[PDB]
Amino acid sequence: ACQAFYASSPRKSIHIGACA
Amino acid sequence: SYDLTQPPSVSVSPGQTASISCSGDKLDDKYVSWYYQRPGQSPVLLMYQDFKRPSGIPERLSGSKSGKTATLTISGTQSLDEGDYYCQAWDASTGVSGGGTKLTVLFGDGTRLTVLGQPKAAPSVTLFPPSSEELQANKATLVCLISDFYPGAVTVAWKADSSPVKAGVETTTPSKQSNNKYAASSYLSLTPEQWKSHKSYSCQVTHEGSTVEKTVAPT
Amino acid sequence: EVQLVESGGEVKQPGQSLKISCKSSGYNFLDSWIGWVRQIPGKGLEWIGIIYPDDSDAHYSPSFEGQVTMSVDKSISTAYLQWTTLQASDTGKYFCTRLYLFEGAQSSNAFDLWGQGTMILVSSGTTKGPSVFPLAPSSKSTSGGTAALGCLVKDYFPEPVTVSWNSGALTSGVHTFPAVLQSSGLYSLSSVVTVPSSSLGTQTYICNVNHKPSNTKVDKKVEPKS
């Protein structure tokens, strides 16, 4: 469980924090 | 939707190491970014993902984290460092409605970093009573000008006959003077009657612990 | 280079609608989220929301959702922010910023690019020249051979107003203070000059006030108290 959003879109992705 | 707390003020001398903390309840699992802003300018990115500084940012700026706290440490604080500092993070809330996720950008209230570049200087005060021309126009205003005080910060208080009064007061923020000291002004509105039927009014200026005042009375 | 240029500032009255803009250039507009931040005078940075230009997906701060609307015009690389009904609480400087994606071991995002900001004043005030009142010198304004006298430039809008003394002949010891925006929405300003007390009975003091916005010029002779 990571903290990535819109991962399926390598350009629209927003990373909130460290995974797990 | 959690809060980000950072000291509204941090003061330091040139060369010293300054520290700006920022804490929030989820910061333990959230990246933090830091921005800089010189009054009247646009924010500048300084740090992201807790400790990574964008190309072009001084190595003297170090980003750290520990528990629910994030810290921006500025070693050898110069003076272009003077300004406001904001920390920021995010939050996500996958709605229980099956689908839909809410993202949130959070900002701390900001820290005003002050680089003491000159000796403490107490404020000079000057209080002007209402003129006859305004009084006849059936209006009255007491003007309290304040200058040459450092650092730039003062709290004003008006006591009509040694008794306070928050109504009718309008004070400005501090502003840098041509000589690098700060200035501000406050106004007190009253009515011609409200002023003539007293013994006096006073403008009290508190600066760096010590406070000075001035007084005026009707003819 | 790469930048975001925002529309010019404005002054509206409560109830009016408004649409401010932001044009990017130098990077693919559609590939980076655009966020909007508000900053009321004196206060800190407030988040309004973010929108992705390629499909206009948006995230609004619970405070603004339904009060303002984010949108972009792909054909011209421009993000907008609109209100149908403005309020006094909407006053402030609005920034337009791009959220950058830092790809690496573990990717992250931060707002690297910002516009210059669009100042928005929501007020009932209307352009007016100021009334100027003399701040006569006195034994209350006399220190060590120096006397302080001035002028009160009241109730004007909007900025700015200039003040000089004796048609520019008097400059030393002149201190024109930044104005106050009254709760009424009108501005008030004060300019004071410290001069030798000995001179009070023979030298004439006049403050020259100029308010370009309303074509108001006024000269005020300041004579010794009572």
Side-chain angles (χ1 to χ4, degrees), chain B residues 196-219:
Chain B
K196 286 203 295 293
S197 53
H198 277 68
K199 301 304 160 299
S200 71
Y201 281 73
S202 291
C203 175
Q204 304 187 181
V205 174
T206 293
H207 166 272
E208 284 302 337
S210 48
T211 99
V212 53
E213 79 171 64
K214 285 309 187 78
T215 309
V216 294
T219 290

mmCIF file with all atom_site columns, all heavy atoms in Angstrom, chain B residues 196-219:
data_model
loop_
_atom_site.group_PDB
_atom_site.id
_atom_site.type_symbol
_atom_site.label_atom_id
_atom_site.label_alt_id
_atom_site.label_comp_id
_atom_site.label_asym_id
_atom_site.label_entity_id
_atom_site.label_seq_id
_atom_site.pdbx_PDB_ins_code
_atom_site.Cartn_x
_atom_site.Cartn_y
_atom_site.Cartn_z
_atom_site.occupancy
_atom_site.B_iso_or_equiv
_atom_site.pdbx_formal_charge
_atom_site.auth_seq_id
_atom_site.auth_comp_id
_atom_site.auth_asym_id
_atom_site.auth_atom_id
_atom_site.pdbx_PDB_model_num
ATOM 1   N N   . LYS B 1 196 ? -14.737 66.495 22.992 1.00 0.00 ? 196 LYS B N   1
ATOM 2   C CA  . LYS B 1 196 ? -14.739 67.710 23.800 1.00 0.00 ? 196 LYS B CA  1
ATOM 3   C C   . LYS B 1 196 ? -15.170 67.491 25.251 1.00 0.00 ? 196 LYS B C   1
ATOM 4   O O   . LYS B 1 196 ? -14.754 68.233 26.141 1.00 0.00 ? 196 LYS B O   1
ATOM 5   C CB  . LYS B 1 196 ? -15.636 68.782 23.168 1.00 0.00 ? 196 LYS B CB  1
ATOM 6   C CG  . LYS B 1 196 ? -15.053 69.442 21.928 1.00 0.00 ? 196 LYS B CG  1
ATOM 7   C CD  . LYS B 1 196 ? -15.669 70.820 21.678 1.00 0.00 ? 196 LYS B CD  1
ATOM 8   C CE  . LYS B 1 196 ? -17.165 70.755 21.358 1.00 0.00 ? 196 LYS B CE  1
ATOM 9   N NZ  . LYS B 1 196 ? -17.463 70.096 20.052 1.00 0.00 ? 196 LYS B NZ  1
ATOM 10  N N   . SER B 1 197 ? -15.993 66.472 25.494 1.00 0.00 ? 197 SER B N   1
ATOM 11  C CA  . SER B 1 197 ? -16.481 66.191 26.847 1.00 0.00 ? 197 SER B CA  1
ATOM 12  C C   . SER B 1 197 ? -15.604 65.254 27.684 1.00 0.00 ? 197 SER B C   1
ATOM 13  O O   . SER B 1 197 ? -16.108 64.485 28.501 1.00 0.00 ? 197 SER B O   1
ATOM 14  C CB  . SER B 1 197 ? -17.913 65.645 26.783 1.00 0.00 ? 197 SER B CB  1
ATOM 15  O OG  . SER B 1 197 ? -18.005 64.533 25.909 1.00 0.00 ? 197 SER B OG  1
ATOM 16  N N   . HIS B 1 198 ? -14.294 65.324 27.477 1.00 0.00 ? 198 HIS B N   1
ATOM 17  C CA  . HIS B 1 198 ? -13.347 64.504 28.228 1.00 0.00 ? 198 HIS B CA  1
ATOM 18  C C   . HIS B 1 198 ? -12.210 65.393 28.707 1.00 0.00 ? 198 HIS B C   1
ATOM 19  O O   . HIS B 1 198 ? -12.219 66.598 28.468 1.00 0.00 ? 198 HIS B O   1
ATOM 20  C CB  . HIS B 1 198 ? -12.783 63.371 27.361 1.00 0.00 ? 198 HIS B CB  1
ATOM 21  C CG  . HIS B 1 198 ? -13.664 62.162 27.293 1.00 0.00 ? 198 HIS B CG  1
ATOM 22  N ND1 . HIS B 1 198 ? -14.885 62.161 26.652 1.00 0.00 ? 198 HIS B ND1 1
ATOM 23  C CD2 . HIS B 1 198 ? -13.511 60.919 27.809 1.00 0.00 ? 198 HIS B CD2 1
ATOM 24  C CE1 . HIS B 1 198 ? -15.445 60.971 26.778 1.00 0.00 ? 198 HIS B CE1 1
ATOM 25  N NE2 . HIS B 1 198 ? -14.632 60.199 27.475 1.00 0.00 ? 198 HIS B NE2 1
ATOM 26  N N   . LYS B 1 199 ? -11.234 64.805 29.387 1.00 0.00 ? 199 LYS B N   1
ATOM 27  C CA  . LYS B 1 199 ? -10.101 65.577 29.874 1.00 0.00 ? 199 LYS B CA  1
ATOM 28  C C   . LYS B 1 199 ? -8.887  65.347 28.991 1.00 0.00 ? 199 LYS B C   1
ATOM 29  O O   . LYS B 1 199 ? -7.989  66.187 28.929 1.00 0.00 ? 199 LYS B O   1
ATOM 30  C CB  . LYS B 1 199 ? -9.785  65.201 31.318 1.00 0.00 ? 199 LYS B CB  1
ATOM 31  C CG  . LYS B 1 199 ? -10.958 65.432 32.253 1.00 0.00 ? 199 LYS B CG  1
ATOM 32  C CD  . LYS B 1 199 ? -11.435 66.877 32.190 1.00 0.00 ? 199 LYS B CD  1
ATOM 33  C CE  . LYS B 1 199 ? -12.859 67.003 32.706 1.00 0.00 ? 199 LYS B CE  1
ATOM 34  N NZ  . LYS B 1 199 ? -13.809 66.196 31.880 1.00 0.00 ? 199 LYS B NZ  1
ATOM 35  N N   . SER B 1 200 ? -8.873  64.205 28.306 1.00 0.00 ? 200 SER B N   1
ATOM 36  C CA  . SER B 1 200 ? -7.777  63.861 27.406 1.00 0.00 ? 200 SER B CA  1
ATOM 37  C C   . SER B 1 200 ? -7.878  62.437 26.860 1.00 0.00 ? 200 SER B C   1
ATOM 38  O O   . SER B 1 200 ? -8.713  61.642 27.293 1.00 0.00 ? 200 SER B O   1
ATOM 39  C CB  . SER B 1 200 ? -6.423  64.031 28.115 1.00 0.00 ? 200 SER B CB  1
ATOM 40  O OG  . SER B 1 200 ? -6.220  63.034 29.103 1.00 0.00 ? 200 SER B OG  1
ATOM 41  N N   . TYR B 1 201 ? -7.027  62.142 25.884 1.00 0.00 ? 201 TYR B N   1
ATOM 42  C CA  . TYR B 1 201 ? -6.944  60.821 25.276 1.00 0.00 ? 201 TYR B CA  1
ATOM 43  C C   . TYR B 1 201 ? -5.458  60.544 25.129 1.00 0.00 ? 201 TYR B C   1
ATOM 44  O O   . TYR B 1 201 ? -4.650  61.479 25.103 1.00 0.00 ? 201 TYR B O   1
ATOM 45  C CB  . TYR B 1 201 ? -7.609  60.794 23.901 1.00 0.00 ? 201 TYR B CB  1
ATOM 46  C CG  . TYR B 1 201 ? -9.119  60.708 23.929 1.00 0.00 ? 201 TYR B CG  1
ATOM 47  C CD1 . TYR B 1 201 ? -9.893  61.804 24.294 1.00 0.00 ? 201 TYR B CD1 1
ATOM 48  C CD2 . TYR B 1 201 ? -9.772  59.527 23.578 1.00 0.00 ? 201 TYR B CD2 1
ATOM 49  C CE1 . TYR B 1 201 ? -11.284 61.730 24.305 1.00 0.00 ? 201 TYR B CE1 1
ATOM 50  C CE2 . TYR B 1 201 ? -11.166 59.440 23.587 1.00 0.00 ? 201 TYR B CE2 1
ATOM 51  C CZ  . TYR B 1 201 ? -11.914 60.545 23.950 1.00 0.00 ? 201 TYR B CZ  1
ATOM 52  O OH  . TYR B 1 201 ? -13.287 60.465 23.963 1.00 0.00 ? 201 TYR B OH  1
ATOM 53  N N   . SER B 1 202 ? -5.088  59.273 25.038 1.00 0.00 ? 202 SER B N   1
ATOM 54  C CA  . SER B 1 202 ? -3.681  58.926 24.899 1.00 0.00 ? 202 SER B CA  1
ATOM 55  C C   . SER B 1 202 ? -3.407  57.757 23.967 1.00 0.00 ? 202 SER B C   1
ATOM 56  O O   . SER B 1 202 ? -4.181  56.806 23.876 1.00 0.00 ? 202 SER B O   1
ATOM 57  C CB  . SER B 1 202 ? -3.071  58.617 26.271 1.00 0.00 ? 202 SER B CB  1
ATOM 58  O OG  . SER B 1 202 ? -2.983  59.780 27.073 1.00 0.00 ? 202 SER B OG  1
ATOM 59  N N   . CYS B 1 203 ? -2.281  57.848 23.277 1.00 0.00 ? 203 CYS B N   1
ATOM 60  C CA  . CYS B 1 203 ? -1.852  56.807 22.363 1.00 0.00 ? 203 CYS B CA  1
ATOM 61  C C   . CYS B 1 203 ? -0.684  56.110 23.034 1.00 0.00 ? 203 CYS B C   1
ATOM 62  O O   . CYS B 1 203 ? 0.357   56.722 23.284 1.00 0.00 ? 203 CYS B O   1
ATOM 63  C CB  . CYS B 1 203 ? -1.400  57.413 21.034 1.00 0.00 ? 203 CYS B CB  1
ATOM 64  S SG  . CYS B 1 203 ? -0.716  56.180 19.886 1.00 0.00 ? 203 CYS B SG  1
ATOM 65  N N   . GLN B 1 204 ? -0.853  54.829 23.330 1.00 0.00 ? 204 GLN B N   1
ATOM 66  C CA  . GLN B 1 204 ? 0.204   54.082 23.989 1.00 0.00 ? 204 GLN B CA  1
ATOM 67  C C   . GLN B 1 204 ? 0.868   53.063 23.064 1.00 0.00 ? 204 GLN B C   1
ATOM 68  O O   . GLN B 1 204 ? 0.231   52.129 22.576 1.00 0.00 ? 204 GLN B O   1
ATOM 69  C CB  . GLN B 1 204 ? -0.362  53.418 25.248 1.00 0.00 ? 204 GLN B CB  1
ATOM 70  C CG  . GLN B 1 204 ? -1.009  54.434 26.192 1.00 0.00 ? 204 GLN B CG  1
ATOM 71  C CD  . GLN B 1 204 ? -1.427  53.843 27.531 1.00 0.00 ? 204 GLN B CD  1
ATOM 72  O OE1 . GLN B 1 204 ? -1.975  54.548 28.382 1.00 0.00 ? 204 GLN B OE1 1
ATOM 73  N NE2 . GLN B 1 204 ? -1.170  52.548 27.725 1.00 0.00 ? 204 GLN B NE2 1
ATOM 74  N N   . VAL B 1 205 ? 2.161   53.263 22.832 1.00 0.00 ? 205 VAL B N   1
ATOM 75  C CA  . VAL B 1 205 ? 2.928   52.392 21.956 1.00 0.00 ? 205 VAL B CA  1
ATOM 76  C C   . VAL B 1 205 ? 3.895   51.476 22.700 1.00 0.00 ? 205 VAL B C   1
ATOM 77  O O   . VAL B 1 205 ? 4.856   51.938 23.318 1.00 0.00 ? 205 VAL B O   1
ATOM 78  C CB  . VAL B 1 205 ? 3.724   53.225 20.924 1.00 0.00 ? 205 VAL B CB  1
ATOM 79  C CG1 . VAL B 1 205 ? 4.644   52.321 20.108 1.00 0.00 ? 205 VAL B CG1 1
ATOM 80  C CG2 . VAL B 1 205 ? 2.758   53.969 20.009 1.00 0.00 ? 205 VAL B CG2 1
ATOM 81  N N   . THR B 1 206 ? 3.635   50.175 22.621 1.00 0.00 ? 206 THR B N   1
ATOM 82  C CA  . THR B 1 206 ? 4.470   49.171 23.267 1.00 0.00 ? 206 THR B CA  1
ATOM 83  C C   . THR B 1 206 ? 5.387   48.543 22.236 1.00 0.00 ? 206 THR B C   1
ATOM 84  O O   . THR B 1 206 ? 4.923   47.999 21.237 1.00 0.00 ? 206 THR B O   1
ATOM 85  C CB  . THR B 1 206 ? 3.615   48.060 23.895 1.00 0.00 ? 206 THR B CB  1
ATOM 86  O OG1 . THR B 1 206 ? 2.868   48.601 24.990 1.00 0.00 ? 206 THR B OG1 1
ATOM 87  C CG2 . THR B 1 206 ? 4.489   46.918 24.388 1.00 0.00 ? 206 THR B CG2 1
ATOM 88  N N   . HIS B 1 207 ? 6.688   48.623 22.480 1.00 0.00 ? 207 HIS B N   1
ATOM 89  C CA  . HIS B 1 207 ? 7.668   48.056 21.564 1.00 0.00 ? 207 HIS B CA  1
ATOM 90  C C   . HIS B 1 207 ? 8.796   47.351 22.306 1.00 0.00 ? 207 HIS B C   1
ATOM 91  O O   . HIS B 1 207 ? 9.484   47.953 23.134 1.00 0.00 ? 207 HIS B O   1
ATOM 92  C CB  . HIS B 1 207 ? 8.241   49.149 20.661 1.00 0.00 ? 207 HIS B CB  1
ATOM 93  C CG  . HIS B 1 207 ? 9.468   48.729 19.921 1.00 0.00 ? 207 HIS B CG  1
ATOM 94  N ND1 . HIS B 1 207 ? 10.735  48.870 20.444 1.00 0.00 ? 207 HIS B ND1 1
ATOM 95  C CD2 . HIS B 1 207 ? 9.621   48.124 18.719 1.00 0.00 ? 207 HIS B CD2 1
ATOM 96  C CE1 . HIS B 1 207 ? 11.616  48.370 19.595 1.00 0.00 ? 207 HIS B CE1 1
ATOM 97  N NE2 . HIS B 1 207 ? 10.966  47.910 18.541 1.00 0.00 ? 207 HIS B NE2 1
ATOM 98  N N   . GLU B 1 208 ? 8.985   46.072 21.997 1.00 0.00 ? 208 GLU B N   1
ATOM 99  C CA  . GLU B 1 208 ? 10.020  45.276 22.642 1.00 0.00 ? 208 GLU B CA  1
ATOM 100 C C   . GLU B 1 208 ? 9.948   45.427 24.155 1.00 0.00 ? 208 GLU B C   1
ATOM 101 O O   . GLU B 1 208 ? 10.831  46.021 24.768 1.00 0.00 ? 208 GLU B O   1
ATOM 102 C CB  . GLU B 1 208 ? 11.400  45.703 22.151 1.00 0.00 ? 208 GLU B CB  1
ATOM 103 C CG  . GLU B 1 208 ? 11.758  45.212 20.763 1.00 0.00 ? 208 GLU B CG  1
ATOM 104 C CD  . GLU B 1 208 ? 11.696  43.704 20.654 1.00 0.00 ? 208 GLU B CD  1
ATOM 105 O OE1 . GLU B 1 208 ? 11.816  43.033 21.701 1.00 0.00 ? 208 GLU B OE1 1
ATOM 106 O OE2 . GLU B 1 208 ? 11.541  43.190 19.525 1.00 0.00 ? 208 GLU B OE2 1
ATOM 107 N N   . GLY B 1 209 ? 8.885   44.900 24.751 1.00 0.00 ? 209 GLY B N   1
ATOM 108 C CA  . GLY B 1 209 ? 8.733   44.984 26.190 1.00 0.00 ? 209 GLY B CA  1
ATOM 109 C C   . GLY B 1 209 ? 8.434   46.381 26.699 1.00 0.00 ? 209 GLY B C   1
ATOM 110 O O   . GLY B 1 209 ? 7.381   46.613 27.292 1.00 0.00 ? 209 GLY B O   1
ATOM 111 N N   . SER B 1 210 ? 9.358   47.311 26.481 1.00 0.00 ? 210 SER B N   1
ATOM 112 C CA  . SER B 1 210 ? 9.168   48.688 26.928 1.00 0.00 ? 210 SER B CA  1
ATOM 113 C C   . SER B 1 210 ? 8.115   49.395 26.078 1.00 0.00 ? 210 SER B C   1
ATOM 114 O O   . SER B 1 210 ? 7.998   49.139 24.877 1.00 0.00 ? 210 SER B O   1
ATOM 115 C CB  . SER B 1 210 ? 10.497  49.444 26.870 1.00 0.00 ? 210 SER B CB  1
ATOM 116 O OG  . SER B 1 210 ? 11.147  49.236 25.630 1.00 0.00 ? 210 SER B OG  1
ATOM 117 N N   . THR B 1 211 ? 7.348   50.285 26.702 1.00 0.00 ? 211 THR B N   1
ATOM 118 C CA  . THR B 1 211 ? 6.294   51.009 25.997 1.00 0.00 ? 211 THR B CA  1
ATOM 119 C C   . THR B 1 211 ? 6.314   52.504 26.303 1.00 0.00 ? 211 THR B C   1
ATOM 120 O O   . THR B 1 211 ? 6.618   52.912 27.425 1.00 0.00 ? 211 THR B O   1
ATOM 121 C CB  . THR B 1 211 ? 4.902   50.471 26.380 1.00 0.00 ? 211 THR B CB  1
ATOM 122 O OG1 . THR B 1 211 ? 4.314   51.330 27.367 1.00 0.00 ? 211 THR B OG1 1
ATOM 123 C CG2 . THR B 1 211 ? 5.015   49.062 26.954 1.00 0.00 ? 211 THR B CG2 1
ATOM 124 N N   . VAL B 1 212 ? 5.979   53.310 25.297 1.00 0.00 ? 212 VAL B N   1
ATOM 125 C CA  . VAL B 1 212 ? 5.935   54.768 25.426 1.00 0.00 ? 212 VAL B CA  1
ATOM 126 C C   . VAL B 1 212 ? 4.533   55.253 25.065 1.00 0.00 ? 212 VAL B C   1
ATOM 127 O O   . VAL B 1 212 ? 3.772   54.522 24.434 1.00 0.00 ? 212 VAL B O   1
ATOM 128 C CB  . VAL B 1 212 ? 6.967   55.444 24.491 1.00 0.00 ? 212 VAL B CB  1
ATOM 129 C CG1 . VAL B 1 212 ? 6.781   54.958 23.069 1.00 0.00 ? 212 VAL B CG1 1
ATOM 130 C CG2 . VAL B 1 212 ? 6.820   56.957 24.552 1.00 0.00 ? 212 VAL B CG2 1
ATOM 131 N N   . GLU B 1 213 ? 4.186   56.473 25.468 1.00 0.00 ? 213 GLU B N   1
ATOM 132 C CA  . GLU B 1 213 ? 2.858   57.004 25.166 1.00 0.00 ? 213 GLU B CA  1
ATOM 133 C C   . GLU B 1 213 ? 2.832   58.516 25.000 1.00 0.00 ? 213 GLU B C   1
ATOM 134 O O   . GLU B 1 213 ? 3.783   59.209 25.349 1.00 0.00 ? 213 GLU B O   1
ATOM 135 C CB  . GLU B 1 213 ? 1.869   56.629 26.272 1.00 0.00 ? 213 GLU B CB  1
ATOM 136 C CG  . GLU B 1 213 ? 1.982   57.497 27.516 1.00 0.00 ? 213 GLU B CG  1
ATOM 137 C CD  . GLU B 1 213 ? 0.856   57.255 28.503 1.00 0.00 ? 213 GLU B CD  1
ATOM 138 O OE1 . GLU B 1 213 ? 0.765   56.129 29.038 1.00 0.00 ? 213 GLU B OE1 1
ATOM 139 O OE2 . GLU B 1 213 ? 0.059   58.191 28.741 1.00 0.00 ? 213 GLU B OE2 1
ATOM 140 N N   . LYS B 1 214 ? 1.723   59.018 24.467 1.00 0.00 ? 214 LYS B N   1
ATOM 141 C CA  . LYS B 1 214 ? 1.533   60.446 24.269 1.00 0.00 ? 214 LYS B CA  1
ATOM 142 C C   . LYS B 1 214 ? 0.090   60.808 24.601 1.00 0.00 ? 214 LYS B C   1
ATOM 143 O O   . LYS B 1 214 ? -0.799  59.961 24.523 1.00 0.00 ? 214 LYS B O   1
ATOM 144 C CB  . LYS B 1 214 ? 1.873   60.839 22.830 1.00 0.00 ? 214 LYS B CB  1
ATOM 145 C CG  . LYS B 1 214 ? 3.369   60.880 22.541 1.00 0.00 ? 214 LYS B CG  1
ATOM 146 C CD  . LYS B 1 214 ? 4.103   61.724 23.575 1.00 0.00 ? 214 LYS B CD  1
ATOM 147 C CE  . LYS B 1 214 ? 5.567   61.927 23.222 1.00 0.00 ? 214 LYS B CE  1
ATOM 148 N NZ  . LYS B 1 214 ? 5.749   62.966 22.173 1.00 0.00 ? 214 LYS B NZ  1
ATOM 149 N N   . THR B 1 215 ? -0.145  62.064 24.964 1.00 0.00 ? 215 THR B N   1
ATOM 150 C CA  . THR B 1 215 ? -1.485  62.493 25.341 1.00 0.00 ? 215 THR B CA  1
ATOM 151 C C   . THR B 1 215 ? -1.887  63.847 24.769 1.00 0.00 ? 215 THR B C   1
ATOM 152 O O   . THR B 1 215 ? -1.050  64.727 24.563 1.00 0.00 ? 215 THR B O   1
ATOM 153 C CB  . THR B 1 215 ? -1.610  62.569 26.880 1.00 0.00 ? 215 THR B CB  1
ATOM 154 O OG1 . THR B 1 215 ? -1.149  61.338 27.456 1.00 0.00 ? 215 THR B OG1 1
ATOM 155 C CG2 . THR B 1 215 ? -3.056  62.821 27.295 1.00 0.00 ? 215 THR B CG2 1
ATOM 156 N N   . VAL B 1 216 ? -3.183  64.006 24.528 1.00 0.00 ? 216 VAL B N   1
ATOM 157 C CA  . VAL B 1 216 ? -3.725  65.249 23.998 1.00 0.00 ? 216 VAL B CA  1
ATOM 158 C C   . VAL B 1 216 ? -5.057  65.542 24.678 1.00 0.00 ? 216 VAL B C   1
ATOM 159 O O   . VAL B 1 216 ? -5.770  64.623 25.083 1.00 0.00 ? 216 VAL B O   1
ATOM 160 C CB  . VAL B 1 216 ? -3.952  65.165 22.471 1.00 0.00 ? 216 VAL B CB  1
ATOM 161 C CG1 . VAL B 1 216 ? -2.621  65.030 21.750 1.00 0.00 ? 216 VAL B CG1 1
ATOM 162 C CG2 . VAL B 1 216 ? -4.852  63.988 22.146 1.00 0.00 ? 216 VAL B CG2 1
ATOM 163 N N   . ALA B 1 217 ? -5.388  66.824 24.802 1.00 0.00 ? 217 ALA B N   1
ATOM 164 C CA  . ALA B 1 217 ? -6.634  67.236 25.441 1.00 0.00 ? 217 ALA B CA  1
ATOM 165 C C   . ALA B 1 217 ? -7.295  68.381 24.684 1.00 0.00 ? 217 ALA B C   1
ATOM 166 O O   . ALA B 1 217 ? -6.628  69.156 24.003 1.00 0.00 ? 217 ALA B O   1
ATOM 167 C CB  . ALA B 1 217 ? -6.368  67.652 26.884 1.00 0.00 ? 217 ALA B CB  1
ATOM 168 N N   . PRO B 1 218 ? -8.624  68.499 24.794 1.00 0.00 ? 218 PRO B N   1
ATOM 169 C CA  . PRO B 1 218 ? -9.374  69.560 24.115 1.00 0.00 ? 218 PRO B CA  1
ATOM 170 C C   . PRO B 1 218 ? -9.015  70.938 24.669 1.00 0.00 ? 218 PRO B C   1
ATOM 171 O O   . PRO B 1 218 ? -8.477  71.046 25.769 1.00 0.00 ? 218 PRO B O   1
ATOM 172 C CB  . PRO B 1 218 ? -10.829 69.191 24.403 1.00 0.00 ? 218 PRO B CB  1
ATOM 173 C CG  . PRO B 1 218 ? -10.774 67.696 24.583 1.00 0.00 ? 218 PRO B CG  1
ATOM 174 C CD  . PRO B 1 218 ? -9.539  67.530 25.420 1.00 0.00 ? 218 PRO B CD  1
ATOM 175 N N   . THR B 1 219 ? -9.314  71.987 23.906 1.00 0.00 ? 219 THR B N   1
ATOM 176 C CA  . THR B 1 219 ? -9.028  73.352 24.344 1.00 0.00 ? 219 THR B CA  1
ATOM 177 C C   . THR B 1 219 ? -9.966  73.777 25.466 1.00 0.00 ? 219 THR B C   1
ATOM 178 O O   . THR B 1 219 ? -9.723  73.331 26.607 1.00 0.00 ? 219 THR B O   1
ATOM 179 C CB  . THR B 1 219 ? -9.170  74.356 23.183 1.00 0.00 ? 219 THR B CB  1
ATOM 180 O OG1 . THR B 1 219 ? -8.102  74.157 22.248 1.00 0.00 ? 219 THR B OG1 1
ATOM 181 C CG2 . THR B 1 219 ? -9.128  75.789 23.704 1.00 0.00 ? 219 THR B CG2 1
#
